[PDB]
């Protein structure tokens, strides 16, 4: 099994280590670090910085990275996470977003085509603050993602964990998003938007 | 329940 147990994890990805992170990667020196500036309704909430684990999940990292910088063009139009939202929020579980196509969880597009396969399932969903791919079954990754708000190992081997948030502010912003009021479908009553994003 | 799908969220 490629899935690492929690005692076999590489240096740089414990909660304590990630919370001491700045704007440079902790797991491998060539990992990109990207950011989202988040607004909740009309209220700026702060910035989430995210290390993408190119060393473990290069295709997943590069897809997310291009959607952060606006580098990817669809029909010659840049498309990505700027203006995208967190459309499904479940307190004590995770925050899900990145559906820039439809804004509701139905959208799927990647830099590789409509979907892309699962990379190796190396890391478990062992703690809060991890970035993982949303999908609709095997080999259906696209643009959506989630950030864990708790341990959620029942997702292991079904979703590729491909990044981690860096620094205390990042987690504070995640927790703010996690606690917004939601409707019966777990959709926030006031939109949670990536107003700006890019690479550090 | 507590999955993270894209299209038909299950229980």
Author numbering:
A (entry chain A): 12 to 211
B (entry chain D): 1 to 11
Paper text:
Recently, we characterized TgCyp23 among the various Cyps of the parasite, demonstrating its high PPIase activity and its ability to bind cyclosporin A (CsA), a well‐known inhibitor of Cyps (Favretto et al., 2023). TgCyp23 exhibits the typical eight‐stranded antiparallel β‐barrel structure, with two α‐helices flanking the barrel on either side, all of them connected by loops. TgCyp23 shows remarkable sequence identity with human CypA (~52% of identity) but has a 40‐aminoacid N‐terminal extension. Here, three new structures of the protein in complex with the three non‐immunosuppressive derivatives NIM811, dhCsA, and Alisporivir have been solved at 1.17, 1.20, and 1.20 Å resolution, respectively.
NIM811, a CsA derivative where N‐methylleucine (MeLeu‐4) is replaced by N‐methylisoleucine (MeIle‐4) at position 4, retains full capacity to inhibit CypA PPIase activity with a Ki value of 2.1 nM but possesses significantly reduced immunosuppressive activity (Schiene‐Fischer et al., 2022; Ptak et al., 2008). The MeLeu‐4 residue of CsA is replaced by MeIle‐4 in NIM811. This amino acid has a bulkier side chain that could provoke clashes with the Trp352 residue of the cavity. Superimposition of the TgCyp23:Alisporivir and TgCyp23:NIM811 complexes onto the structure of the CypA–CsA–CN ternary complex (Huai et al., 2002) clearly reveals that the side chain of MeIle‐4 in NIM811 and NEV‐4 in Alisporivir cannot enter the Cn hydrophobic cavity to establish a proper interaction. We observed a steric clash with the Trp352 aromatic ring that constitutes one wall of the Cn pocket. The MeIle‐4 side chain of NIM811 and NEV‐4 side chain of Alisporivir prevent the TgCyp23–drug complex from interacting with Cn. Remarkably, both NIM811 and dhCsA closely resembled the TgCyp23:CsA complex, implying that chemical modifications at position 4 of CsA exert negligible influence on the binding to the protein. NIM811, dhCsA, and Alisporivir are attached to the CsA binding pocket. Remarkably, all the modifications in the non‐immunosuppressive derivatives are exposed, protrude from the binding site, and are not involved in the crystal packing. All three compounds inhibit the catalytic activity of TgCyp23, with IC50 values between 0.8 and 2 nM, with Alisporivir having the highest inhibitory activity.
